[PDB]
Amino acid sequence: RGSHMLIKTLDSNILREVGTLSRAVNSINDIKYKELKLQKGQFTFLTRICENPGINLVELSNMLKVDKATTTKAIQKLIKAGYVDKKQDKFDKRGYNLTPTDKSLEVYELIIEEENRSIEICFDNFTDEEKQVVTKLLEKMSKNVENEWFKVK
């Protein structure tokens, strides 16, 4: 702490704000999901598996915009914790299909409840028009960075 000033060399604050928002939501999700052992992004992988049963690790990486190594490590942990089953694919011998276990089906509703609670917090004091606007413009930002990720990966 001291006397501060704006950073003149950074063209925009937009990614700092996106990092702040993202670290904050994940730090808070780390509190809620510690007891369930779903902290550090685990709940993210789980929801996608529940929403798309049979998805494979490659598809799951592409959906989440991370590399396969990240996905592999997270899937191993979720299997060990009994949230996911993997089965070798019938047609590609080194693919796996991911499926949710009976356990994770109860948690799924819990997770979605939590997401809607975080969503409500994000939108505190938003008008409906602001909601729509920011929703749409984030989509546009998202698609730009998606495109780049497919080129660069």
Query: Residue numbers of the site for its own copies (CB under 8 A)?
Result: 1, 7, 9-15, 17-25, 27-28, 30-31, 44, 51, 59, 64-67, 112, 115-116, 118-126, 130-131, 133-135, 137-142, 144-146, 148-149, 152-153
- Residue 18 vs 105, nearer CB to its own copies: 18
- Residue 54 vs 82, nearer CB to its own copies: 54
One-letter amino acid identity for 128?
Answer: D
Helix (H, G, I), strand (E, B) or coil at 72: helix
Closest CA relative to residue 49, chosen from 103, 111, 104: 104
Rounded (10°) angle between helices 68-80 and 42-51:
90
Closest CA relative to residue 32, chosen from 23, 21, 43: 43
- Residue 11 vs 102, nearer CB to its own copies: 11
Query: Cβ of residue 149: shortest distance to its own copies, in angstroms?
Result: 5
